[PDB]
Amino acid sequence: GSNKGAIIGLM
């Protein structure tokens, strides 16, 4: 989806 797994870069 919204690259949530990447959102970690700025949760």
Token output for 7: 């959102």
Task: Quote the CA–CA distance of 4 and 6 in Å, as a whole number.
Answer: 5
Experimental technique, in short, is NMR
First to last CA, the chain: 15
Query: What are all long-range contacts of 3-11, with beta carbons under 8 Å and residues at least 24 apart?
Result: none
Rg of the chain in Å (alpha carbons): 6
- Single-letter amino acid, residue 10: L
Task: Quote the CA–CA distance of 11 and 7 in Å, as a whole number.
Answer: 5
Cβ burial 1-11 (10 Å sphere, 16+ → b, else e)? eeeeeeeeeee
Q: How far is CA 10 from the centre of its chain?
A: 7
According to DSSP H, which parts of 1-11 are helical? Answer: 4-7
Q: How far is CA 4 from the centre of its chain?
A: 3
Residue positions counted in the chain: 11
